[PDB]
Design a protein around this nucleic acid. Sequence first.
DNA 1: ATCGGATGTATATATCTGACACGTGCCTGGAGACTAGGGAGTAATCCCCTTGGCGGTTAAAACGCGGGGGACAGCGCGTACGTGCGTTTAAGCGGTGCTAGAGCTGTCTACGACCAATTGAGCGGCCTCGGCACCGGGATTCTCGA
Length: 357
Amino acid sequence: KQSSAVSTSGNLNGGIAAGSSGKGRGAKRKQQDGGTTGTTKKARSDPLFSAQRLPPHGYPLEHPFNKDGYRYILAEPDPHAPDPEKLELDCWAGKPIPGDLYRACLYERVLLALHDRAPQLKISDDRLTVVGEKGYSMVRASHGVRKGAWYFEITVDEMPPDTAARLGWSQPLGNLQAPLGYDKFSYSWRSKKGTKFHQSIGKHYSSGYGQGDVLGFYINLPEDTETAKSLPDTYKDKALIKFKSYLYFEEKDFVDKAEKSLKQTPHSEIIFYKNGVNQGVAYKDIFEGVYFPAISLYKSCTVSINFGPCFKYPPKDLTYRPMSDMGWGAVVEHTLADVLYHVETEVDGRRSPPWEP
DNA sequence: ATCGGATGTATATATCTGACACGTGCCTGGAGACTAGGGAGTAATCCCCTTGGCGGTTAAAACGCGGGGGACAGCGCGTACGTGCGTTTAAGCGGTGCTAGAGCTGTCTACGACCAATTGAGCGGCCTCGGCACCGGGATTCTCGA
């Protein structure tokens, strides 16, 4: 309400368009020894310190979850995107590409991302179950599908009568306080009777659900060709912030789409299984945009997502991919995204192979 | 009110050990058994202190009633005291060495223990009377407004 000037918080200011290329002037270059963060190349220890795990569900206490179309991710220093070699005779040959950052994820495996949960959403990493207290809420996994066919599961550990979880997929723009299907960008199942919920509309084109159901979830979206028919460029936003005691990265998320025309992604579908037994097709009409597996809680619902290598009734398809596979695929993809952005800003020129892949 | 840095503190680790849990052979206090006396326990009696009540009095308590006096809150300053860092200093380890004095045993003896015979120092009880307590009144001195 003042002017096109300094950011809304004096805690950290990013370089405005008039202060272009202003890197986040957060912590000073003068660091303390510390000792705990003095890991070297000879030691074998994961620098991403996961919090203490507790059998009772807990809350991430100092994480400002996504809002206003503003995505929030973990940050690590990464003082140099590694390009160190011998001192070449030409002192103007190589570029260090000092991004001084990375999207390192606080996860041993592809799990339910804590960055995209509601403040009323509790997790227990003993089974990575998710639970709530009042009404409905939504959580999502770490990964997100953009093409191909894949598959995961949800295991339900507690379903009292006043406890009805919902399980399915949701694109970004999905308000994580809504019950996973209240908008047109989410398609789920209600875990009282198998009922497909989308646009808050319930449809009985489905089988029946059981209290101890280990439910399999198969979903096939077309390649990014039929998804976009154009450039699927991924120019990323990256902003450095130093929240109360830790460094984090902000990126710009998508905006609420007013899409009211139906253009289904070609040959995309969703299939639901009960313990591998085909519960049937859920949604053939699938809108564009990346999707991610999501779970909605009612009052005190206990469910958990699960990947493929520890499966119970897996499909024997050679094309579908477990949660972990697409997870590390997207992780490596965002690594290359950081690489390319630091290249763009740091070294003149860019170049990519024969487009098709 | 927050964050960053400094610093101080709780933790895991490793090993060293010397207290310490453990077991012995040997000692004597504890148990076991037996005898006596007599402290203690019971009971009937007496006394007599206490606990109870009753009526009259007022000094005392209840209660009220200003109101000056200080409890208290605040406010300035400043001096004395925490602090961190200097400095130097005896404190502690430890180990040595001598023995003065605890600390033990073996007498033997004076010394109460104890009992018995004796009684007069002392104690309950009974007059008694004089400092003492009370009272009334006069004179003295503190105190609160000039």
